[PDB]
Amino acid sequence: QIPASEQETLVRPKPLLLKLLKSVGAQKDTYTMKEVLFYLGQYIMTKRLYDEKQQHIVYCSNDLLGDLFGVPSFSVKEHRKIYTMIYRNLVVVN
Ligand SMILES: CN(C)CCCN(C)[C@H]1CCN(C(=O)c2[nH]c3cc(Cl)ccc3c2-c2c(-c3ccccc3)ncn2Cc2ccc(Cl)cc2CO)C1
Ligand SMILES: [Cl-]
Ligand SMILES: [Cl-]
Ligand SMILES: [Cl-]
């Protein structure tokens, strides 16, 4: 869904995305997009934000993730939509 070149893009999360990443063990100040997505997956999984049955549906209206993304819920199958939301929360480095 997302070209490898884009997944490999180097980025610097803005402070609130950063603090969220670090809350699930992230150790750096910059990341590839692939790494950002990896840690956001850890966040969603460990906080159990996904629907019990249709586990690709994420509910975030009672979480800081909803504030960061600007939505109450989303589907994890929509990778471009997710990337678009994440780019509003970081600065591209390279
Ligand atoms: C409850 N289960 C269904 C969870 C299973 C979790 N998976 C083992 C991990 C494997 C790597 N994963 C993630 O990196 C991974 N990272 C994410 C970051 C965001 Cl913002 C949203 C979803 C994911 C996510 C993921 C999920 C997922 C994650 C948690 C709960 C429910 C489902 N299911 C497929 N993926 C893969 C995926 C979805 C969207 C996008 Cl843009 C990028 C990628 C990366 O391929 C999911
Ligand atoms: Cl990815
Ligand atoms: Cl990588
Ligand atoms: Cl998927």
Side-chain angles (χ1 to χ4, degrees):
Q1 293 197 42
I2 307 294
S5 54
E6 184 173 1
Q7 297 171 6
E8 299 156 12
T9 307
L10 187 65
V11 299
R12 185 182 293 280
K14 295 174 174 180
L16 191 48
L17 175 57
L18 191 64
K19 178 173 172 170
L20 189 152
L21 299 177
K22 299 209 226 142
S23 81
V24 294
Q27 301 292 310
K28 304 193 296 170
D29 293 323
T30 62
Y31 295 91
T32 63
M33 286 294 284
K34 205 175 176 59
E35 291 172 329
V36 174
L37 273 298
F38 179 62
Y39 280 113
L40 284 173
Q42 176 81 357
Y43 181 90
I44 294 166
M45 193 160 354
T46 62
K47 290 193 80 176
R48 293 287 202 268
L49 300 181
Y50 57 90
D51 189 272
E52 294 196 32
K53 201 279 180 181
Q54 295 191 5
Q55 303 189 343
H56 62 282
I57 300 301
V58 174
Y59 307 114
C60 49
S61 70
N62 297 317
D63 195 272
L64 277 174
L65 183 62
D67 297 278
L68 290 186
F69 279 7
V71 299
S73 58
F74 62 96
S75 169
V76 308
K77 299 187 180 182
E78 298 193 301
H79 295 195
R80 175 54 62 197
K81 288 180 169 65
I82 294 164
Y83 264 61
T84 298
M85 294 186 292
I86 293 169
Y87 282 127
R88 293 171 187 137
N89 286 284
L90 50 70
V91 177
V92 171
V93 176
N94 189 62

